[PDB]
Design a protein around this ligand. Sequence first.
Ligand SMILES: *[C@@H](C(=O)N(CCC(N)=O)NC(=O)[C@H](Cc1ccccc1)NC(=O)[C@H](CC(C)C)NC(=O)OCc1ccccc1)[C@H](O)C(=O)OCC
Ligand SMILES: *[C@@H](C(=O)N(CCC(N)=O)NC(=O)[C@H](Cc1ccccc1)NC(=O)[C@H](CC(C)C)NC(=O)OCc1ccccc1)[C@H](O)C(=O)OCC
Lengths: 299, 299
Amino acid sequence: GFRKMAFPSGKVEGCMVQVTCGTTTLNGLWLDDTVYCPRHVICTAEDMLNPNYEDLLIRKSNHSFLVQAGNVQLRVIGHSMQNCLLRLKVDTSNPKTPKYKFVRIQPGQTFSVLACYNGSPSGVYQCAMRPNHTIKGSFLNGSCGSVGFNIDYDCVSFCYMHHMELPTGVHAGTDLEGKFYGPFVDRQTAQAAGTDTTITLNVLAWLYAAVINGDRWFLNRFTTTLNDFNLVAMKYNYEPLTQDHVDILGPLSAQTGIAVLDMCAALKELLQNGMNGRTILGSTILEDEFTPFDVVRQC
Amino acid sequence: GFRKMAFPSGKVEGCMVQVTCGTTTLNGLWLDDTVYCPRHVICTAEDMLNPNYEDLLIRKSNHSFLVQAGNVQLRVIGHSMQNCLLRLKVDTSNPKTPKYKFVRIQPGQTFSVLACYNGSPSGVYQCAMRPNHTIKGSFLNGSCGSVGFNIDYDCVSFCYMHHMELPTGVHAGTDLEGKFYGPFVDRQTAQAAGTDTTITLNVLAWLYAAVINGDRWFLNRFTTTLNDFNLVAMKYNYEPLTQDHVDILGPLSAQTGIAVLDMCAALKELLQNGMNGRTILGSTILEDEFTPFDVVRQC
Ligand SMILES: *[C@@H](C(=O)N(CCC(N)=O)NC(=O)[C@H](Cc1ccccc1)NC(=O)[C@H](CC(C)C)NC(=O)OCc1ccccc1)[C@H](O)C(=O)OCC
Ligand SMILES: *[C@@H](C(=O)N(CCC(N)=O)NC(=O)[C@H](Cc1ccccc1)NC(=O)[C@H](CC(C)C)NC(=O)OCc1ccccc1)[C@H](O)C(=O)OCC
């Protein structure tokens, strides 16, 4: 009984619109009287390579942007750019605008994604920002403009807007200020993602989730120093854990009574001597897409 | 009595060499039997724009790399690339190699820079990784290959190698695995740095340094919520403070007896109603290049 769960998506659902320029349609986010969407809505087929966006934008009329909420057009009366996003000023304030913030997320942090085509929601899934600033999503042509978010009590924190699919089939996007996560750019030029690594802080959190859920077999038989843990773990392509991360595990260490370095030690033995044929929470493989915050949430 | 201080530079001084290819000479770092240096040592004048480094490297002989420690050549017997760095295998193990680690640093963290020309040290200064992944250094033509570092007890943590000067006169570089900090690339093409912001976590730390040093006038007359602090501060181009940062100030909050949100409140009033004609630690301006760790260190 421990599962990836998404946030309920209803509050974000009533912000989703479609935005069409020419023959190209993608998703936008409608909040108050603004629609946010990827500025590549404005590109034609023959210049996705080196689009001059500010030149393409300045020659475009308000009327060229067809914005629809369901069957209902929303007249665009302003447009401007914000980094890699467009802000379109519309007709009408979204009567469904929830309480919201725009947040820029850190590598390792998880959010829910509401996957959309043609302004309509298809599904919600939970994922993470990877150490290499990509995300492992599930997105098809037309997904661009889909948003990632977290929700606390009554406030939607928007953190992600989908822009690109990499050659390896992972994904890249921006915050809601239009700023890319990672060294990526919105044009179809040859780029390169960093080698990815395992989110160590998250794998520990999920080992704490296991203990809380009653799973104890892998508890540590040997001791470790922070440094000695890092020397082994890096070899398995795990992120270095810093003292800042150690400090992040304090509350789960306090609630379980397992010192953070004792769990670091369990993790080392797991990697080395392993489950080999064993499971933790019913899982082969060490799960690295739950934060300390998610564990505390769902437990 | 509170000053920017650099780490003593002696341990890093005996790692500094010069590396010359053709007519181009820069600095390298000699540890054990490897010299690390920026791979742009290999570029000629007419292709700094789009250097094909792996092609330029593969056609280069070991002998083309002239490496000198003082007056003394060190024969290069291997070369390879690692991201934006070269690793040259040499003759001789540095008898002056200290205890060391390679660390990748976070925005906001400070290190000392040992500025070098032609393998010789000229000066040391303390600085920070900016939220926009540049550094505000003092570097002239030939500085490339200079290193940033921290030292704890007896171990040198290398974090930075200098590569580029931006149009605005700030600076860009890599970790010691050759990976750029920030979305920058080592070629003289048109690029762009993010708008920079003030390191909030650091300005608070420096207000704690003030209290410890006996400066109390600006202590808060009104209260604040984390959120309400952020709403004001962002307006002054300060980074958002997260709960993770709040947690980082715990020990200085414990040692001074000033709750972190009380200091957040002081900072808000300072920004709004201000020192206007007043000083804190003898400073006009709020200093944002000391970490919580530096304050605790020098206090
Ligand atoms: C928009 C859309 O749905 N998506 C995502 C589709 C998906 N499977 O996730 N976005 C795109 O398809 C991008 C459109 C675009 C963006 C900017 C400028 C021009 C066009 N294009 C890509 O994602 C493209 C996919 C190709 C199959 C390669 N990505 C790249 O070029 O990768 C660059 C790169 C990154 C890192 C390493 C190497 C290379 C829908 O396509 C749409 O409406 O487009 C309007 C133009
Ligand atoms: C190496 C050297 O000393 N420095 C730094 C000098 C300093 N003042 O800090 N490095 C360079 O000069 C870079 C050399 C280089 C790097 C890669 C490929 C080719 C050459 N060049 C630059 O720093 C250059 C400076 C020009 C005056 C603009 N920078 C850029 O091109 O900026 C790119 C950019 C970034 C962000 C926004 C916009 C643009 C010494 O120069 C040497 O030995 O060179 C060997 C080639």
